Design a protein around this nucleic acid. Structure first.
Lengths: 119, 81, 60, 52, 28, 135, 50, 101
RNA sequence: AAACUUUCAACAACGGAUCUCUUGGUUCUCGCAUCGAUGAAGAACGCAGCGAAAUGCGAUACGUAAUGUGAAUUGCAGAAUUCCGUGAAUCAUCGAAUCUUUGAACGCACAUUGCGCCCCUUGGUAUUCCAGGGGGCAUGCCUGUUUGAGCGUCAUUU
RNA sequence: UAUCUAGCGAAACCACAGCCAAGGGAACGGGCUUGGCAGAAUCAGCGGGGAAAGAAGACCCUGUUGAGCUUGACUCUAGUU
RNA sequence: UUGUGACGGCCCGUGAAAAUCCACAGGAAGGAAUAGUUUUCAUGCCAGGUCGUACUGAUAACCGCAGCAGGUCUCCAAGGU
RNA sequence: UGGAGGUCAGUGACGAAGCCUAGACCGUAAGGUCGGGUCGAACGGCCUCUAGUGCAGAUCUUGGUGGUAGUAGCAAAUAUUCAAAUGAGAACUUUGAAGACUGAAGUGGGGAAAGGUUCCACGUCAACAGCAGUUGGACGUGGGUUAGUCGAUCCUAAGAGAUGGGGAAGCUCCGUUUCAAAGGCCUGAUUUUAUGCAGGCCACCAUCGAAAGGGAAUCCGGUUAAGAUUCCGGAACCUGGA
RNA sequence: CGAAUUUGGGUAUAGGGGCGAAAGACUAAUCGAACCAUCUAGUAGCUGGUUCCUGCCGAAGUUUCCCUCAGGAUAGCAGAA
RNA sequence: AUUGGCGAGAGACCGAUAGCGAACAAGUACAGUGAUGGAAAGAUGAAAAGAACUUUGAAAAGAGAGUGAAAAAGUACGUG
RNA sequence: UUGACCUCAAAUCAGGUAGGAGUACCCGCUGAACUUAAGCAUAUCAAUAAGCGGAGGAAAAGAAACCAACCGGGAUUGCCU
């Protein structure tokens, strides 16, 4: 059928690495058998299985580093928010909202008063 | 002898495959691509060559990263799951 | 005789033949095929038999 | 606005036993040497193109 | 099964473009 | 002046366009000075420029550049407007003091050709406006 | 030429692999209008120009 | 009209000099310190034919006054100069054929 | 009288007009603002049980993960009461990953799959040699940090 | 070689076509007028004719169409002084 | 026929470069209880990656629209007259 | 004639549109209507609206097709013949027997450029090989190119070309050592140590550019359907390395 | 037919430019100014073409002016209202 | 402002020699050293039911037969 | 002797930024000729095409060194005029 990522996320590094080696062994064995028989679709889910194991392995490694750098500035660029180059270079919400003390005392004193005309 | 017998003398390629575009337009002795202008940093283009710009613009290729930006923009450049 | 990766060299092929089949190799000879895939000729030492390793891989 | 004009066709002139209508250059296609740009030409521009 | 799509190679429409001698007709 | 970059002075056209020598660059020397600097320090934004000195061959100017990604300018809202991308290469498009002077951007009857931009003004008064119910 | 670069040899490879008739099984696939390989190439007829 | 033959020489494409077989720029040694308050001796090791030059050239080896090194110089050969000959260069050099007064 | 041009309530050819069809174009209008040194656009080479092209993808390669829907895919096969379920699917989403060789393209070079240097490893019983695995080494700038230079200059006279 | 045969198999060209004589006609007709006449289908040749074919005459002229070249043409111009 | 050698003739023509390798000059440094150097003597041990390698090279494998009497560089070279 | 508004609660799979028909009728005519055949999904009348609206020609465009005409022709490079076998099928394929030619500046044996798989094997003949074809550089399916020593790589050549810098609005141009602050290896140190810290020589100035120039080193015998100075068996050499 | 020889590869020179023992030669079958795209559907007093029927009316080649003489304007001739 | 991008709604527009060059494996094929040039090509049928089987032929194919509402729809496929 | 300051430098010093793409619209620079003038040179085409630099969802402009001359309006932009 194929291994499941939600299962692998309960397994440790040594279990997953061992799970990877015998899968690569199964794939290597299957590629030998690919020559003798015309069709063998089992090779597809073994490649999927190999990909699933590598997906979770990378996920724990990336998560491991994520809280290693947690709480301090200068996370790795590969860990940072990708969104877009121009968005990344845009002023922050704090920096774009900054005003001078002169402006601040004017905004406090005379804000846009809410009113209505009656008649 | 400018016709048929002269055509038999030509066996030295003057252009080879360009690195930036695989076109066979990289001039060997000028070290330039007549199509894309490699190794200049910009790509060779002209507003008088409208067909030429249409042959290699954005969308003629895979847009391996650009095909996804609109979907990423519509979801508001989110992070998480 | 193996189809090996294009990025392989004779050192990397030798190491893999030992790690995947537990047999020391004498000499590795490699070519790029006309169909564009790398082929290797690995000579196992004289104290081995190639069809012994081959049959237990699964081909004759 | 550019329908029927997206070609570099040029007239051969007289002396070649063909009509003086512009013809596509180059070779090896089938399009090469064919009439272009004319309202009488297959693939050419229509007469007095419709405007918005 | 070894189908036969016709080649349909094109031929240069220029054809021969030569006249007799050099002129054969200069000042009739 | 700016010499017309033609080989052997051959302009290949009408006599009115035959001039080569006494042709004047339309931008100022302050503009080229700060465009050349803006390419050198391409990370900064050109704030202004001014004359410092001159001799027979060289006019000398000082350029003011502002580091947009220095956090002292990202904060301090008196200066962070230049961090916004609409101010990329102001000197290039002519948004500096010398750039506004060269494009003729000024109020008055004297600038009728250059108020919203000369090319903008020209395209506007060279457009045939047609309404649905034709006037 | 016999003494060819790797880049040229790789181009020889892709052209040789592409130079095949259409698989006979894809003909029967539904809504398919591919009856033959219209991008076939013969060394005598059309040169690959590299 | 077209650009004429003498006009095309300044571009220097096919009119540059053929300099492959030349033995170097024939020059006197640098007027350094010795040549102007004394003299320096050197030996002509060979006189050779310089391609494209009618005149023969003389290879002369002087000693470096400031470092332990043999400095070769490419002099134009004057008539009578022979290999194995000393030539004296400087203000105090004697008035002899080959000297650099 | 035959054989040898014309017309057919005539058939058959050649050829692809006409007619009817339209997942295309064209034009108009309305809304939105989002490419790239976190490496874009573009290119090359590959990747499917059976693919050449085309689509998609990058050695995790017609794809992985997360999510929703809830039994397909389908040319032939092939894991199947995989089906009252953390679950099919060339399905939709799509935020997490992989993302080869390149390209503004960045160690140097490039018509070479060329040649280096630094760090940590492993091995060949080796700081230096070789090989393997993993990390790295471009310019122009900006801000700061150290190390300096200059009888440019100040204190400061062993 | 041509020729004849088996296979294979183009092109140029083509308003329609294809016997003359005179006439008159855009003043040299295959056609029109008046006469001579006139009988299938054809083969090899042939160079009288088709004012044969090949090219919107290259000569000449016209055009308020060029271009190469030259000069004390007109108007400028790089450079140089 | 090719290579080599020793020569001779010619030039107002005198007939590349670098990588690389060695040699020489020199006299810094170092050398006495089983030691010090010789790894330019002999013998011994290990490694030598990457990319190319089929075939034609022409009256049919190249270019001339083609399996075109054209064009396209070079090596080997039997007997007789 | 195409399309549009309105209407005929129009025609129609019991057959619309289209097409063919020396069948009919009507109109001077443009054309309209209808019989018959073919055909299969739409389409007409009338009142109006609108236009990319009517062809014989333009050496018109694109496409298709004639007469010419089974005609011109398929004649350079001396040349073929006999038999067998294989095949429906042999002038052309294989085998044998002959006869000939290239006649060693070859019609021989290799390479360079170029080609790119034409190499080789097996099936195979619709098309291509201007006759033919059982044959093939064709078609389909596969196999095949093995290096420390053969080349590239390394080196510089004419020459290309960064940096420093100077022009240029600018794409860029010049410039190549120039008016630049452009440099390793031995017991230095040799236990927060490998540059925490007085151990020399400089006067180097990028890099790219030869598969015929310069270069480190390999030979013989055997082997394959096809590779070999590479594989195998012997016998050597060079470079690096304690 | 031993040289001002023939020739391969590398390299350099690019379009009013190159290169030319000089022919306006050669510069990819292009040369008294290459090729490609665009401006560009360039302009043409000039050549050619210009698509259904019937009905009624029905010409001009003349005047004056124009770098006008193969063209225009103007008047005349014609139609329609 | 907007003949580009993304997302939508439309038309007295075009209807495969038209409409964008491209309605289709179209900037594909092919040409040119190169800049660049640049096509043709849409329709079986409701469903492949794509013609089983028998005889002539070496075979392609024919003649039957069969499927289909129609082979006057046989893929060299609507009409023709 | 030891610390500064100024200017200048160096580091694979710690952290960043620029370059390219697309370019319908936008901001600049640079810049023709065909054409029209029934010839043509100013003019026109056109402050256009082509070329180069630089942005955003808009850009530019923009709160008067403005317009006015009135009994005065009152940043900029755009539409009608």
């Amino acid at each position: 059928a194929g291994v499941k990522a939600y299962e692998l996320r309960t397994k440790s590094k040594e279990q997953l690495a061992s799970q990877l080696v015998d899968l690569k062994k199964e794939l290597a064995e299957l590629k030998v058998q690919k020559l003798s028989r015309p069709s063998l679709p089992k090779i597809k889910t073994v490649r999927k299985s190999i990909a699933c194991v590598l997906t979770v392995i990378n996920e724990q490694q990336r998560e491991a580093v994520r809280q290693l750098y947690k709480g301090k500035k200068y996370q790795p660029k590969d860990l940072r928010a990708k969104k877009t180059r121009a968005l990344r270079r845009a002023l922050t919400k704090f920096e774009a909202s900054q005003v001078t003390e002169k402006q601040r005392k004017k905004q406090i004193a005379f804000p846009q008063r809410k009113y209505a005309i009656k008649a | 002898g400018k016709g048929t017998p002269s055509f038999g003398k030509r066996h030295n390629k003057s252009h080879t495959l360009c690195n930036r575009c695989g076109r066979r337009s990289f001039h060997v002795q000028k070290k330039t691509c007549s199509s894309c202008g490699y190794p200049a940093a910009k790509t060779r283009s002209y507003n008088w060559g409208a067909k030429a710009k249409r042959r290699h613009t954005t969308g003629t290729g895979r847009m391996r990263y650009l095909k996804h930006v609109s979907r990423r923009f519509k979801n508001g450049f989110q992070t998480g799951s | 005789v193996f189809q090996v990766s294009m990025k392989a060299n004779k050192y990397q092929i030798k190491k893999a033949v030992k790690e995947l089949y537990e047999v020391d190799v004498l000499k590795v000879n490699t070519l790029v095929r006309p169909n564009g895939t790398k082929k290797a000729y690995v000579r196992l030492t004289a104290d081995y038999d190639a069809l012994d390793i081959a049959n237990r891989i699964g081909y004759i | 606005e550019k329908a029927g004009h997206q070609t570099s066709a040029e007239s051969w002139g007289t002396g070649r036993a063909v009509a003086r209508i512009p013809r596509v250059g180059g070779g090896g296609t089938g399009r090469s040497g064919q009439g272009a740009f004319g309202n009488m030409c297959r693939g050419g521009r229509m007469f007095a193109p419709t405007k918005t | 099964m070894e189908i036969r799509p016709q080649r349909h190679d094109e031929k240069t429409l220029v054809q021969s473009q030569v006249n007799a001698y050099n002129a054969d007709m200069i000042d009739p | 002046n700016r010499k017309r970059p033609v080989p052997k002075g051959a302009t290949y056209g009408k006599p009115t366009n035959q001039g080569v020598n006494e042709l004047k660059y339309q931008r100022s020397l302050r503009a080229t000075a700060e465009e050349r600097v803006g390419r050198r320090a391409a990370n900064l934004r050109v704030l202004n420029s001014y004359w410092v000195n001159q001799d027979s061959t060289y006019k000398y100017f000082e350029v003011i550049l502002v580091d947009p990604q220095h956090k002292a300018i990202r904060r301090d809202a008196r200066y962070n407007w230049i961090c916004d991308p609409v101010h990329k290469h102001r000197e290039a498009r002519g948004l500096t003091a010398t750039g506004k002077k060269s494009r003729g951007i000024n109020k008055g009857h004297k600038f009728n050709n250059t108020k919203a931009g000369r090319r903008k003004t020209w395209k506007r008064q060279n457009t045939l406006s047609l309404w649905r119910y034709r006037k | 030429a016999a003494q060819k670069s790797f880049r040229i040899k790789q181009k020889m490879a892709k052209a040789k692999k592409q130079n095949r008739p259409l698989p006979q099984w894809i003909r029967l696939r539904t809504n398919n209008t591919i009856r033959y390989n219209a991008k076939r190439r013969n060394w005598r007829r059309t040169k690959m120009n590299i | 009209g077209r650009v004429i033959r003498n006009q095309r020489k300044g571009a220097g494409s096919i009119f540059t000099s053929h300099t492959r077989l030349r033995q170097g720029a024939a020059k006197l040694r640098t007027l350094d310190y010795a040549e102007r308050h004394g003299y320096i001796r050197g030996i002509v090791k060979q006189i050779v034919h310089d391609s494209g030059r009618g005149a023969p050239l003389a290879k002369v080896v002087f000693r470096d006054p400031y470092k332990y090194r043999l400095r070769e110089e490419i002099f134009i050969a004057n008539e009578g100069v022979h290999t194995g000959q000393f030539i004296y260069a400087g203000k105090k050099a004697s008035l002899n054929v080959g000297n650099v007064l």
